[PDB]
Amino acid sequence: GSHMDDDLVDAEGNLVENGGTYYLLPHIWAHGGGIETAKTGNEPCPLTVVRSPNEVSKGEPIRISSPYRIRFIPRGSLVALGFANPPSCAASPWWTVVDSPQGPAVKLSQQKLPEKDILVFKFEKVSHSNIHVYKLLYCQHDEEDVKCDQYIGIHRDRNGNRRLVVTEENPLELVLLKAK
Amino acid sequence: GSHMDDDLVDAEGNLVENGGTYYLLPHIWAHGGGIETAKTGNEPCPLTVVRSPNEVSKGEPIRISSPYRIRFIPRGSLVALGFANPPSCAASPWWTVVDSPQGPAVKLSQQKLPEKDILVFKFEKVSHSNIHVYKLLYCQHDEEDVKCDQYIGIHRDRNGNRRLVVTEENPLELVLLKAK
Ligand SMILES: [Cl-]
Ligand SMILES: [Cl-]
């Protein structure tokens, strides 16, 4: 069963488009907003991917991209995630996971990255009727194959920056909203 | 060693207030939403305490009451738990653990319960970080010196209801969010 039911769908009931721009909206009980950036510690600019604490904000427009020449994004297929309008200090728009003092965290980079470093995300369906909710998987470089066994979660820090990090116990759930 | 945090702490890091309203929510977002009622079996009304399946819902406002003439709830203290807005058919807002073929379950009652029947709950703190997480125990005691080890957990029934029951499966690990 291939199924059209396998492609990602946005909050409006429309197929998620490769290269399209979307807002990533946490689907959990804690109030807040979409995903955006923030400057933490060292960083000379916002290189830390975080969930907005503001509730009226849908966060930053984000591109969901598959290198392959497909119009729609199938679940379980690898994708790169990035900001369509990243901080002037970021080399590229793409998110990447780097081990931080607090553990594997989602950040932007000041140096261009190879394909293998950005194609590390995958959306996993959470069963709901009428709506489409997903969990976000992270898949390190298991050499040549792929290996999605870790999820992305939120780790509130000292200042209250809701940082996106790799979590083994508490994954985020998200809905995708087409950024017009 | 002491340090106030030997009084129950809410989600916002502030001490829990006796007789105040709170939302009992899962530390793990994917587990669902807040606590509410459901009509199960031959119940003529919502007398079964359950966790909401909607991850985004905070559920029912719940009052945490200590039987003492105090303002803040001391850890290790017995508390009564009740819905501030209970179903009309309910004699009182207070939860009680009633035995049943499936085992002991958390229910509301159409008849008034004696203090000894509602003063049976205790919150047990599981460590980690700054956000306080607590397991929930059912304790039927009096004059000893032993750690109560009967926890309340989730058991999903044939119809999907996520019933709160005394069990070792799906132990509840809650955060207490102050309502308003
Ligand atoms: Cl959050
Ligand atoms: Cl839980």
Swiss-Prot record, chains A, B:
Record keywords, A-Z: Disulfide bond, Protease inhibitor, Serine protease inhibitor, Signal
Disulphide bridges: C45-C89, C139-C148
A UniProt-annotated Pfam family: Kunitz_legume
CDD domains named among the record's database cross-references: beta-trefoil_STI_WCI3-like
Tagged with keyword Disulfide bond: yes
PANTHER family, sorted: KUNITZ TRYPSIN INHIBITOR 2 (PTHR33107), TRYPSIN INHIBITOR A (PTHR33107:SF81)
The protein's role, per its UniProt record: Inhibits alpha-chymotrypsin at the molar ratio of 1:2 in state of 1:1.
Protein name: Chymotrypsin inhibitor 3
Source organism phylogeny: Eukaryota, Viridiplantae, Streptophyta, Embryophyta, Tracheophyta
